[PDB]
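Subject: mismatched residue count in predicted assembly?

I count 548 residues in my input, but I want to confirm that the predicted structure covers every chain. Input:
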Amino acid sequence: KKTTTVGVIIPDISNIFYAELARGIEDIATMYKYNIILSNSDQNQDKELHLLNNMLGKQVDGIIFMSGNVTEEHVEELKKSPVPVVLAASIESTNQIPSVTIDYEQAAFDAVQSLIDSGHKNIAFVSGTLEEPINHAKKVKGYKRALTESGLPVRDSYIVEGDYTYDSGIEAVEKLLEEDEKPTAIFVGTDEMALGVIHGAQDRGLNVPNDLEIIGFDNTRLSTMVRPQLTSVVQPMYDIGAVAMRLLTKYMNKETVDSSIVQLPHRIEFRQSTK
Amino acid sequence: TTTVGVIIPDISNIFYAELARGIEDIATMYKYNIILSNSDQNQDKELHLLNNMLGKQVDGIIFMSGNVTEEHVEELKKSPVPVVLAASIESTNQIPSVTIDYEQAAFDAVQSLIDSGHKNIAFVSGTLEEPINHAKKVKGYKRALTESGLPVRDSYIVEGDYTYDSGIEAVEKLLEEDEKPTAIFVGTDEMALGVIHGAQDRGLNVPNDLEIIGFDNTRLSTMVRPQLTSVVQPMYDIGAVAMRLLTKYMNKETVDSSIVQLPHRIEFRQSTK
Ligand SMILES: O=S(=O)(O)CCNc1ccccc1
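Triage response: the counts match. Full output below for your records.
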């Protein structure tokens, strides 16, 4: 009888993928007939860790926690949690907290592989804050794997760190176009920077995809809000939401989880940003 | 342990997120907790989100909605905690609120267009059923047109649904018109982007073949080629301000300015020749 309420925390208002996913979670939650409280942490552990105390105080029965750096410190406070909490689209390398994500490493590799097969030999990578695991530990690595496996060179200058803003993407293409030999394809860590990559390349006079093929990531709304429409790695937001809910529900009902660390499949939605 | 809840219709929408940014900033300044609720502008969900918020003992509420009905103010009057409407219109002004003159901002927009010698100017609006539209933006678009002696063409007023897609559709429709618009004023930036693309996709050039003026001036305004000329309604300020106004109430302070109205302007970019 007691209406169940789940807490959802996203790292920020910037990266629209998180917000969209939160929305995806809320959707699935509505059918369970659950309540949803959404908090924003601006990715500073403190607020994240306190939110874990603001969510209980606000009597939520469970939490879907999103984050770009679930440090071992997080893990500790987490395990101690009163209410069940599971991660959504967040790597937590120790595998000690229930989580559901896609295999980012494979996504990145498939994406660049995609371009290898198009005939590109020197492909650059514009990523997000390197300090975050999804980047330095998965996306950078799936990118490098793709190149080295195809016997391509791995230049340091071909991997540029941005800060998830559309502007960082622009500056990223400029730095890259100031390179000895330019890249013919650039894989970008998220759609918004990607949109910035397209644009900067388009303002310098380059044509997408005829001169520079670009693939983005997350497959957010921005994906189809550009010309040429952005082909992008798909991280199935509803799959994430659904799995995370049954998982969290099982927990709330004090059931058992045979698979606590679930990894959902991924695909690449191909559009006009690639030949 | 102060904590305020806020009801917007969609945090994932870059538009409502910029507002959330100011809400959140004054929030951390005052060391305050924030809780968001997504409405999807669905009335039934608004009432619900309102009850849930009260049920969670929030000390204040920032509310934003496409249509603040009369039943809304009624139930919103029963609130034991201060409620301040952000970027939402409600004529009676009996619920404090911070906004901008939407009728004037709209007018100014289509007006700039008139100046550049535009005669057949259209309007890609959102759900007309919404007050901000039928009673403010649409109105002002008709005023600029008439005060300047222009043919207010009923088929030059297309209703989209705030999605980037309806803006694409609306262009195609406007292009199917016997008399093609020489320019288009769009209600939101998201639809504006849709308008620019639809046009370009049919082979047209902005601003040389079609000038387009958006409204909101979100970051989406700079994420298009050509860059969108848009009416500025500083969502971040509205929200920062809405929080400070709410805070006074919550702390039982004085508010000699119950309904605040921030100023507006037009950011001209390359969407306007
Ligand atoms: O996730 S799948 O099982 O593949 C399709 C699920 N549809 C669904 C089921 C229960 C709740 C919400 C959505």
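Chain B has two domains: 1-101+233-264, 102-232+265-273. Marking this ticket as 'not a bug'.
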